[PDB]
Design a protein around this ligand. Structure first.
Ligand SMILES: NC(=O)C1=CN([C@@H]2O[C@H](COP(=O)(O)OP(=O)(O)OC[C@H]3O[C@@H](n4cnc5c(N)ncnc54)[C@H](OP(=O)(O)O)[C@@H]3O)[C@@H](O)[C@H]2O)C=CC1
Ligand SMILES: C[C@H]1CCc2nc(N)nc(N)c2C1
Ligand SMILES: [Ca+2]
Ligand SMILES: [Ca+2]
Ligand SMILES: [Ca+2]
Ligand SMILES: [Ca+2]
Ligand SMILES: [Ca+2]
Ligand SMILES: [Ca+2]
Ligand SMILES: [Ca+2]
Ligand SMILES: [Ca+2]
Ligand SMILES: [Ca+2]
Ligand SMILES: [Ca+2]
Ligand SMILES: [Ca+2]
Ligand SMILES: [Ca+2]
Ligand SMILES: [Ca+2]
Ligand SMILES: [Ca+2]
Ligand SMILES: [Ca+2]
Ligand SMILES: [Ca+2]
Ligand SMILES: [Ca+2]
Ligand SMILES: [Cl-]
Ligand SMILES: [Cl-]
Ligand SMILES: [Cl-]
Length: 159
């Protein structure tokens, strides 16, 4: 079971110059809660951005080139990334944009944080077909002292 997990602002913008330009710690707790104790697959650009392997998660990095860090598992293809996970109840694909595009047809579930933020981006989440996905969880939250925007946690399962 391959899942994609991502945070989308207005117009599916997910990043700008290798950062996620919003202040929303509620998404960080949601991300941690939903990925802990599960293998995480990421692209090289996302890996370089975090700088350290995510604890309590096998970290699988996609790159066409040989790996440069033995603390993580390096892979050269989508199918080799999935194989590297072994038999686990759930695999989490955590970004970035190019990795989401390739894994989307292979995913069975999407965990989306819809952020009410106007952001200029250079990275977008893929344009998934609404008819192919069913929302099975949808929780809206207003902004507060810690979270600068209103947001919604959504779980969609492939029909
Ligand atoms: N909002 C959110 O939810 C998230 C947003 N982001 C954002 O996304 C952006 C980064 O995304 P993006 O620029 O698309 O880059 P990615 O992080 O998706 O990484 C791209 C690199 O991954 C490697 N790769 C991808 N596919 C394959 C493949 N099939 N086989 C072998 N290697 C592959 C390549 O590395 P190589 O060139 O070495 O071959 C490629 O250059 C940043 O702005 C980041 O902040 C990231 C995570 C979450
Ligand atoms: C590096 C982490 C930071 C926060 C985050 N949040 C969600 N909802 N999905 C993700 N893939 C990520 C990537
Ligand atoms: Ca746009
Ligand atoms: Ca600028
Ligand atoms: Ca950032
Ligand atoms: Ca990042
Ligand atoms: Ca950091
Ligand atoms: Ca470490
Ligand atoms: Ca980390
Ligand atoms: Ca490279
Ligand atoms: Ca597997
Ligand atoms: Ca693509
Ligand atoms: Ca909005
Ligand atoms: Ca806002
Ligand atoms: Ca782009
Ligand atoms: Ca869409
Ligand atoms: Ca439709
Ligand atoms: Ca809502
Ligand atoms: Ca369904
Ligand atoms: Cl952590
Ligand atoms: Cl807004
Ligand atoms: Cl808002």
């Amino acid at each position: 079971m391959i899942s994609l997990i991502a945070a989308l602002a207005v117009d599916r913008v997910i990043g700008m110059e290798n950062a996620m330009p919003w202040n929303l710690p509620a998404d960080l707790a949601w991300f941690k809660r939903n990925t802990l104790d599960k293998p995480v697959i990421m692209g090289r650009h996302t890996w370089e951005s975090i700088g350290r392997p995510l604890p309590g998660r096998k970290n699988i990095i996609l790159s066409s080139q040989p790996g440069t860090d033995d603390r993580v598992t390096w892979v050269k293809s989508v199918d080799e990334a999935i194989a590297a996970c072994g038999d686990v109840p759930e695999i989490m694909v955590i970004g970035g944009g190019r990795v989401y595009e390739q894994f989307l047809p292979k995913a069975q579930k999407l965990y989306l944080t819809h952020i009410d933020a106007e952001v200029e981006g250079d990275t977008h989440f893929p344009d998934y077909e609404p008819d192919d996905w069913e929302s099975v969880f949808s929780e809206f939250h207003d902004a507060d002292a810690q979270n600068s925007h209103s947001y919604c946690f959504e779980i969609l399962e492939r029909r």
